[PDB]
């Protein structure tokens, strides 16, 4: 019959509707195209599906990193540019060249940077204050955040105005200077009266201080330079951007890395009309960053810029806890292509989500009409590592493909200094 | 033949699916009509509104552009929430209007220009300061509107209806000075006498400091959306903006769209009027205070709203579940463009929205089943849509053709 | 016979569906009746109320206008929450009353006109200041009512029952002056002695500053909805307003409707009374403090409420799920006009409301008499009528009857 | 069937597969030395994927963990054991081994100061001393506490007096003003001053530290460092013991030590041959660990192997919160189900669903989807009986847990 070596369930006589499952080789051939393509677990990825983004969901130790490394690699062979959120500088040590850029406050090779370097028009202040101070986890936390951005944008605006665009100065005024002195320095800015006149006003200012005291730190200790992610995006000859950090400092650099990633997100929306552009945004673990203020729009309006986002994810519960259910749903829905690497059996909810995501099919069998999941939650829970279900965006069948561990020579040190 | 599931002997009840061509025949009418994915739209369904739901990159924009186009051929007027001035560069004429604080061709505007009676102050304060996301956020908003309407009312009274002055008093003037300026207005005592009163005033300041900005930097003029709606000879209104400034202009655009919404409710009795409101992405605007009534009482004015939507979770996050449900329920005609497989919930909603049918198959058996499975919606290729017009009509899976339109005008003209 | 699903051999239990004509025969009665979509309504079902649920543009208004009309032919009195004065321009007579602060024909009114005993102050303060949407909003509301009832009580006492004065003291007079004016009232100490006390007073001010406005600008007069209810010779009450001012008049209209609700509970023992309360859109009013009791204890007063409704999600957002459920449950008779397909939840609720039936075929089957999809495919002016009690439902066509405009809808003051 | 509790079947299609105890033992047996889970040799590759042992009180979690620990010691692996009543200590404790217990005479001297090596380490371990708050508001306080803790400790260390006593005095005894004074010069200088909110925040911090610090202060002094210990191969095993009646009192201290191990392993140098086990008898009895998650996800390089006991899923939920607890559980690839109480059908359902369903073909042919293990089957398990489901593509098996006897080669507690 049908559904053998392809469909895990009982073979069937006729397929009616729903999700189609096909053999690995059959998909590879089916999705193969004329132009140069990149590969997902050895499956050539449909060109049109690239800017629709890819979400790679999988339990810890199943191959998300292998998969993303292979994707990045084949992308480089095609000569595409990319920004890689790279933990421990792994990708850097493998594909990093000399013309490439490194952003890491603790690596000797890092460029010098400050969010000031991205300001070009007045609307840019709030725009990037949104990157420095990501969205709050809760409504109340976001209210504080907003106060923090008000304080940040007005204080930075003035410092820049009087010719001293210093993060050190910015940090001093917003978190060290006494309450009165700050209010004084604010006189003349839109924040002049907003932060005064009532207890509420003072409370709000106090909230702002705390927020900025939490976010700014790593921004301040960042080696200075005139590097601009915006300019870098415009320079074709510019290389690839590697955002690296050592795992033990992950929580410390969370707000800085979340800022850089967000900067790339809003910034691509300003790049000039250029069809030939192809920019990949590799995010190893979407849930480990903060609630990004621009990721959503980037995933929705980045087609013109040729933005291609690929993000790894372990539990759907993570993204939920970071963005919130409603918001997280929208975020996920923005990634048209999906890859399921099989999760843990101690987490049946995710296995169910992934199973449901893969979809059901209506089939005609012998002895008749049946609706069933093409991939059972249990099937996903039993997947061996380095094995994945690939479901490209649009009207294409999914397939269970083996992920091969390709070896890459270390053509550069991961960390220096 | 057109039903994706197993063929059946007899149809009993529920949603009925028909072939693209068969629906086109069915919905075809004598009078001039507009088209939805190449399907002539029933005249009576136009003022019942249309909701176009679809994943990013599936064709919502193509569909809305085609609708707008055929609408223009019929000579109808329209207000288009137009991103990057795309629609503007294609169908924009010289008699047409442009609202964009950064485009040189923009008209000059201030919400003052819409005030005609006393009840109009709160009415449009409701537009300048949209509804709060949360109950607490709305409470602040209300304080903001109180502060806004009373301060503007006085400014207008003393003959200085300036947004600059309004912005100065409500966000720059010291607390005391403001209280002073308020003396004589209904807001005189409301914002004084206790900590709570002061807190409320502080809340109002913040809100207005968030909304007003783009209103202030807006080029001044005497253009009035109200007057414009009344002038038959007036053209079409194009609300444009550059994507990178979307978040910055969110509160301003949300104001203009809302202004159109309440304002049509005052237009004089005119059956021949046909006004379309094209909203590319309903969830990208703020919680509109008047959208609901407009979608419910705009029939007399001949209001026809068409809105794009990606995830139902968005609208929910903006208006709130209960409220978003009511909003969606106000759009009688639906179009489903197929979403992502990473979001099975929406696919389920869309599937359920398209409905089930009870059928008799093969002696015989009775079966209830979704006419379109969630999976079927998740597998739709781009530019393919299910069209389900309001009322008792079958749905159909139709191909969306990408029509080409000559750029008869620049999308943006840097205002210097 | 007449059902949408597969025909069956035998009916076992559950909701039973019948043909339009068959129901018309079944519900027809000896006495004069009113009609619901051309179906004579059982007399006993009248005071059990009717809820007409239906998508925008399906015929709720047509249906209510017909009901009102046949009700007038029978000579019943009624209060009509009438948008744009549509019902007024059609069935409005000269002996009839009009309440609209902006219409020249409006009577003069103030809630003072309803006060007759001491318990009436809070009673109508509950009408002027409807229930809060959220618990916190209601807490403020309560402070507002305290401030409202005590200030009004004193103004009436010293002989100056003025809404203008009431509004001045409660929202314009400085904090201290107000406290001063309160001295002697129960509100004397309640609003003083701590920050909390002061905060509460501030809350009250805001609330009244939101509700009172339209009450103040209302043309003064001595008209009393209470008295009007008692006067048999009184006409019908038309509560009208222009749609563009709907949000502005929301709190005032909500007050009048509520006043009618509590007031009917005081009318004297009169079996022959028949008073209809037509509410075009129940969800467009505020959370009415007395609607519930009216729908439950209005029989002896002969109260008959008919309300229109679009989405169940609306009522929920206004009264809250639990409360909204109780409200809806109070309407024994239901009419379903078919909704939009973009809202499958309501279609499901309406389908479930219409009920299932157990039937014998071919063989035992339980199924919805009306599928959610069937309700989503109803063409306009088509409705399912399910009268209260043990009666079958029926799918009936709603005819658009034409009514001559025997009076202007609005007459600018 | 002999392995499957339900009706025997003709053919297996997909899903979870169940096999006999002996058959799994054969299947998972490997060439190298392995450790055992209820007598079943554990796949080497599954070790660093962690193991979650769920089971009702009195079913065998402790027996199972003791056996695992034992066979692990025979292979010569190092381990950190959260050991109640020093049970594991009295059985496998040697002389080269370490003991952390403020009330045991054999304890090493410790202070979190001993773990600081770089500047980013202050917050890093402040996160260990002050675990995550149960609720969002509780965590906000906690964060203030960490700010106060890290800045005060940083200064104390700076001026040469890294004393927990001094730290505790300044943060919870010194008058408000004096503290603010001592803070002058630190990042916390202005943060905790200038408004009521600021003062409120400081008050919150005080309370938090006053709750956590206590046991840290009364801890015998020393220069022992869990970080250094991890680096010393010749170091022994770490036994974290405490007497049950003092469990609640030592909760925040034990939670700090376990967390310290969690972040610290992330700094250990590149060493493939390392094998470090983290035995946590009851995961829900600790606080919301700030580093457990990363440890369970990035500890492979370090060779971290975590084994945790758990009674009700409702516990973990109450501690970490549903979303977070789900992620936590999901990080343990291998599962062991010891059967719970019938008074708790929810957990039995979760465990049943976790074990998974299978699609099978049976002779009346018929296709059936069913749970391999019914909730009722789990509720009827006799003690010392467990379902073993190793990570990856391996069948589960119902195996008997044997109570092995271990000689008491050392006293469990030695009062000080
Ligand atoms: N350089 C390598 N050599 C051998 N196996 C590797 C290598 N990198 C990754 N793997 C395999 O991939 C598995 C999962 O780790 P990884 O691929 O990084 O994905 P994850 O994102 O789930 O951590 C490892 O358990 C191992 O089997
Ligand atoms: N001018 C065009 N040229 C080619 N393809 C187009 C054009 N406009 C739209 N499309 C097609 O329509 C798809 C959907 O994008 P769009 O029409 O903007 O709708 P959506 O609102 O879903 O983003 C694009 O991926 C592309 O394939
Ligand atoms: N006087 C009329 N002339 C023509 N059509 C009318 C008239 N009144 C009502 N209708 C019809 O009735 C439908 C319902 O409008 P209405 O009766 O106001 O109810 P509702 O708006 O509550 O659904 C319209 O779709 C139209 O088909
Ligand atoms: N030293 C022992 N001697 C006899 N039985 C024991 C011993 N230790 C454990 N057991 C058995 O194991 C059961 C479960 O207790 P335990 O192994 O501590 O697990 P848990 O408390 O985690 O469920 C006991 O009821 C007993 O039957
Ligand atoms: Mg990884
Ligand atoms: Mg679009
Ligand atoms: Mg109506
Ligand atoms: Mg135990």
């Amino acid at each position: 019959s049908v559904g053998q070596g392809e469909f895990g369930g009982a073979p069937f006589k006729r397929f009616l509707r729903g999700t189609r499952i096909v053999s690995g080789g059959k998909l590879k051939r089916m999705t193969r195209e004329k132009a140069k393509q990149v590969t997902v677990a050895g499956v050539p990825m449909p060109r049109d599906a690239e800017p629709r983004h890819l979400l790679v969901n999988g339990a810890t130790g199943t191959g998300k990193s292998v998969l993303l490394r292979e994707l990045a690699y084949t992308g480089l062979l095609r000569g595409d540019r990319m920004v890689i959120v790279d933990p421990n500088g792994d990708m850097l040590s493998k594909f990093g060249r000399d013309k490439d850029i490194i952003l890491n406050p603790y690596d000797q090779r890092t460029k010098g940077w400050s969010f000031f370097n991205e300001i070009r028009n007045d609307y840019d202040w709030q725009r990037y204050a949104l990157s420095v101070v990501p969205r709050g986890k809760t409504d109340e936390a976001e209210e504080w955040a907003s106060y923090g951005r008000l304080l940040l944008r007005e204080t930075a605006k003035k410092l820049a105005l009087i010719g001293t665009p210093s993060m050190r100065e910015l940090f001093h005024w917003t978190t060290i200077a006494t309450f009165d002195d700050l209010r004084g320095f604010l006189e003349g800015t839109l924040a002049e009266s907003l932060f005064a006149g009532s207890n509420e006003a003072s409370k709000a200012l106090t909230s702002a201080r705390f927020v900025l005291s939490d976010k700014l730190p790593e921004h301040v200790t960042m080696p200075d330079g005139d590097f601009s992610i915006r300019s870098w995006l415009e320079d074709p000859n510019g290389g690839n951007l590697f955002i690296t950090w050592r795992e033990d400092m992950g929580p410390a650099l969370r707000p800085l890395i979340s800022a850089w990633v967000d900067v790339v997100c809003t910034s691509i929306l300003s790049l000039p009309e250029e069809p030939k552009r192809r920019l990949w945004l590799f995010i190893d673990e979407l849930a480990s960053l903060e609630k990004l203020a621009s990721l959503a729009d980037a995933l929705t309006k980045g087609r013109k810029a040729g933005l291609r986002v690929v993000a790894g994810l372990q539990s759907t519960s993570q993204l939920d806890d970071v963005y919130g259910v409603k918001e997280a749903q929208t975020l996920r829905a923005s990634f048209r292509s999906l890859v399921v690497l099989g999760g843990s059996r101690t987490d049946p909810k995710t296995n169910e989500d992934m199973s449901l995501s893969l979809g059901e099919h209506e089939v005609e069998r012998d002895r008749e009409r049946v609706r069933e999941r093409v991939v059972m939650p249990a099937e996903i829970a039993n997947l061996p590592d380095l094995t994945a279900y690939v479901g490209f965006a649009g009207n294409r069948p999914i397939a269970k493909v083996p992920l091969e561990i390709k070896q890459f020579a270390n053509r550069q040190p991961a960390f220096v200094e």
Side-chain angles (χ1 to χ4, degrees), chain A:
Chain A
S1 313
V2 199
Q4 310 202 188
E6 281 194 348
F7 171 53
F12 51 102
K13 177 208 174 66
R14 188 181 129 141
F15 170 99
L16 290 174
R17 16 115 86 138
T19 293
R20 301 222 63 207
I21 184 169
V22 131
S23 76
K26 188 135 92 174
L27 179 59
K28 290 173 181 166
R29 288 126 133 114
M30 301 189 50
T31 55
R32 175 159 262 112
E33 284 176 32
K34 350 235 164 178
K36 273 198 178 179
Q37 300 168 291
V38 281
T39 57
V40 182
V43 182
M45 174 181 230
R47 293 278 254 178
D48 62 71
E50 282 169 42
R52 307 261 125 117
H53 320 299
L54 179 72
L55 181 61
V56 183
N57 192 68
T60 177
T62 57
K64 316 192 234 14
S65 299
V66 164
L67 193 160
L68 262 64
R69 211 183 302 132
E70 158 183 341
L71 224 183
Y73 170 63
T74 67
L76 289 171
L77 295 180
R78 196 170 70 185
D80 321 320
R81 297 184 70 194
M82 48 207 256
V83 176
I84 302 174
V85 178
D86 189 32
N88 301 307
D90 172 61
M91 295 265 256
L92 171 65
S93 73
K94 311 283 186 51
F95 320 125
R97 295 120 53 198
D98 302 36
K99 55 179 299 183
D100 291 334
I101 300 300
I102 293 180
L103 281 178
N104 182 329
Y106 303 79
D107 194 301
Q108 179 141 175
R109 302 161 289 184
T110 184
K111 308 295 289 190
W113 181 87
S114 156
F115 81 107
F116 275 109
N117 300 9
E118 311 299 351
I119 304 299
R120 293 190 180 165
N121 303 290
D122 192 63
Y123 70 92
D124 285 328
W125 290 108
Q126 164 67 330
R127 189 181 180 187
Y128 293 102
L130 238 11
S131 305
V132 178
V133 181
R135 298 296 190 188
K137 176 171 182 172
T138 70
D139 282 326
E140 192 184 65
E142 173 51 23
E143 179 193 346
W144 298 327
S146 80
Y147 290 147
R149 305 198 197 84
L150 164 56
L151 176 59
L152 174 60
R153 84 173 89 89
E154 288 305 308
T155 300
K157 204 187 296 188
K158 180 173 187 174
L159 285 175
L161 221 237
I162 72 179
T164 64
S166 165
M167 281 308 306
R168 229 139 221 163
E169 269 302 86
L170 178 60
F171 179 80
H172 162 63
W173 277 122
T174 59
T175 71
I176 308 289
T178 67
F179 230 57
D180 308 19
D181 293 314
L182 208 193
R183 285 234 190 55
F185 179 62
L186 286 175
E187 295 186 50
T189 60
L190 301 170
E192 186 182 4
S193 292
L194 291 177
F195 285 133
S198 70
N199 291 308
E200 188 62 11
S202 293
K203 179 191 169 191
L205 213 211
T206 291
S207 296
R209 297 266 263 178
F210 277 128
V211 176
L212 269 24
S213 94
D214 279 325
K215 309 302 169 178
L216 293 186
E218 287 310 314
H219 282 267
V220 179
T221 65
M222 235 279 151
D224 243 291
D226 59 357
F227 178 87
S228 170
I229 299 178
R230 296 188 67 174
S231 304
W232 176 79
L233 291 174
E234 298 171 304
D235 176 1
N237 301 306
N240 299 314
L241 205 192
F242 290 77
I243 298 181
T244 72
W245 74 91
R246 297 165 57 237
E247 277 173 349
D248 68 355
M249 296 191 290
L253 297 171
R254 192 181 175 241
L256 209 200
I257 296 173
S258 298
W260 286 327
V261 177
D262 187 85
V263 170
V264 173
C265 283
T266 329
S267 298
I268 59 107
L269 261 50
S270 290
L271 292 180
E273 189 61 63
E274 219 108 316
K276 283 187 195 314
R277 190 189 295 102
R278 285 190 232 114
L279 211 205
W280 294 86
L281 207 203
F282 282 99
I283 306 176
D284 76 305
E285 187 56 50
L286 188 58
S288 292
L289 299 182
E290 300 225 17
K291 199 180 184 185
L292 301 183
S294 319
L295 215 204
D297 286 312
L299 294 172
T300 272
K301 310 169 187 175
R303 213 192 299 127
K304 318 198 205 91
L307 210 217
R308 298 163 164 60
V309 189
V310 168
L313 201 56
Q314 289 179 126
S315 250
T316 48
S317 48
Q318 240 172 319
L319 200 63
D320 281 7
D321 195 57
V322 177
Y323 293 79
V325 178
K326 289 303 174 187
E327 202 136 344
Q329 184 182 317
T330 302
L331 188 59
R332 268 153 23 216
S334 293
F335 295 75
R336 308 299 305 296
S337 303
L338 172 69
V339 168
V340 178
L341 281 163
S344 175
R345 66 178 98 231
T346 59
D347 177 27
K349 305 234 163 278
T350 299
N351 298 327
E352 165 65 10
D353 292 349
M354 296 300 95
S355 174
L356 213 196
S357 291
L358 261 8
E360 304 195 319
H361 72 186
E362 199 164 55
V363 133
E364 219 159 54
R365 246 183 298 253
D366 238 21
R367 295 187 176 70
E368 276 263 319
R369 273 134 229 156
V370 181
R371 246 178 51 232
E372 29 171 46
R373 297 292 189 66
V374 172
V375 186
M376 280 179 64
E379 300 195 77
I380 296 183
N382 294 306
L383 284 176
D385 304 309
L386 297 172
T387 299
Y389 278 99
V390 172
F392 289 122
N395 181 46
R396 342 187 81 134
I398 66 170
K400 176 181 174 183
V401 175
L403 223 188
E404 99 170 359
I405 302 177
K406 190 173 184 332
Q407 292 295 182
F408 303 90
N410 284 198
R411 59 188 275 181
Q412 206 177 187
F415 185 62
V416 172
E417 238 278 306

